Amino acid sequence: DPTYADYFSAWDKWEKQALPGEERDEAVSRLKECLINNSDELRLDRLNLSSLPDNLPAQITLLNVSYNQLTNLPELPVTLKKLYSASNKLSELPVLPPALESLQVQHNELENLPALPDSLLTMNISYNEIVSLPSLPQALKNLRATRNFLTELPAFSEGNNPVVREYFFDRNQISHIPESILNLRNECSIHISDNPLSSHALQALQRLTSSPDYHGPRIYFSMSDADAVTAWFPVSQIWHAFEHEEHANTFSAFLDRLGFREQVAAWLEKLSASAELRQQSFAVAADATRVALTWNNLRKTLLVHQASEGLFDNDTGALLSLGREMFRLEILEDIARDKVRTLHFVDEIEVYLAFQTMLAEKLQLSTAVKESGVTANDLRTAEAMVRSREENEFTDWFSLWGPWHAVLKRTEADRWAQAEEQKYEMLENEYPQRVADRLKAAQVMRETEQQIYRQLTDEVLALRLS
């Protein structure tokens, strides 16, 4: 809270530090004139200023410093209602006064925004390098963000009364439309052309907005948006893997390669070295023409070849707890498949991974990265359903599990061989019960081996370590 003389002398010193090519002298006269009166407005635009003084008149409600060479703004007056600072070289904004209604800082070098007050009605942040936004106030009816580095459309809320709202997010890096935009009324307009959007969300946007019986928001968009495919985004072994490219099932088994990116390379890692892995990965990973049930399969095909070696010979305790995780994952996939029915702009794999990471803590899914439309209720129900199906189905499931059948195939025979030798049921009772209720209405070939392998898993090989 400076005194008149402090303002004057601070501005006089600030003037003598003028870089040539700027009108600091004129700004001081406008600053003094602003102080001398009760003036709510201060305009220092188009003077090519290289900086503002530290202390600006504390009572002003409008500040225009557009078209200068500013890299920084000082602490803005708390009574500020409208801040025009377009066409500068700003790297950061200060904290915004709480009563701000308008913010024009387009054509700067901004990477981030401070907290937007609740009073903000209009905002122009276009032609910056912003990567993501804070939560936007509801009073915000006009927002222009053209040509930034945004990755995500913000989830709007339908205000209780309908007012015209316009959002320009064109020429960004947005890749995912949130399901929330269909809540909004027709009085709101969204511009998302020139964004790297999926062709799925494109075709969804096409289908819904190109229907009669559509009362949502006006969304403006443009649908205009073999072997050297695998090692690209993980560099060197593109030639090493080409030796394997001259083989079977590589056109739909490699082109279909659409945190996670880190160890998709560490799953690339041993399929790289050993030919045993994807002599059989491409087995059912190319004839499935849902990609989370497959992604789980190649997890399994990975895990059977390890169990083929014998990592779980005496350590079946850690094999069992891993099947507990992988069972809850394959329940989560069915949760995911159930939800994508109701979502338009995402497919199962994305929803699956949303469930996996948002629940990795609560359900102890170690094999998950610690990073959409998934609410808080479908997280609660997802846990309630996996926990109950776990209680009812895990042991039957683990007895049929692949990795464990492998460690029995390697470690500890007898029972394993005996189990296979009890194939009497597959011919002494398999023809009568074959359609014994298919006409009273291979399903029992899965029901019979369940019985024996669970029976094998009655007098288990796990009661030798414990």
Author numbering: -1 to 0, 22 to 244, 255 to 263, 270 to 293, 304 to 334, 340 to 421, 428 to 497, 512 to 536
In the authors' words:
IpaH9.8 is one of the most well-studied members of the IpaH family and is secreted by Shigella flexneri during infection. IpaH proteins function as E3 ligases and subvert the host UPS pathway to suppress the host inflammasome and innate immune responses.
The near full-length structure of IpaH9.8 (truncated the N-terminal T3SS signal sequence) was determined by crystallization and X-ray diffraction at a 2.75 Å resolution. The final refined model of IpaH9.8 consisted of Thr22–Asp244 within the LRR domain, and Ala255–Ser536 within the NEL domain. The LRR domain of IpaH9.8 adopted an expected solenoid-like structure consisting of eight LRR motifs, with both the N-terminus and C-terminus capped by two helices (right). The NEL domain of IpaH9.8 is an all helical-fold structure, consisting of three subdomains: N-subdomain (from α5 to α8), M-subdomain (from α9 to α13), and C-subdomain (from α14 to α17) (left). The autoinhibition mode of IpaH9.8NEL-FL is similar to IpaH3 in mode 2. Structural analysis revealed that Phe395 in the NEL domain makes hydrophobic contact with Ile196 in LRR-CT, which might be important for IpaH9.8 autoinhibition. Further structural analysis revealed that six hydrophobic residues (Ile196, Leu201, Ile211, Leu216, Leu224, and Ile238) located in LRR-CT constitute a hydrophobic cluster. In addition, this hydrophobic cluster forms a hydrophobic pocket in which the Phe395 of NEL could be confined.
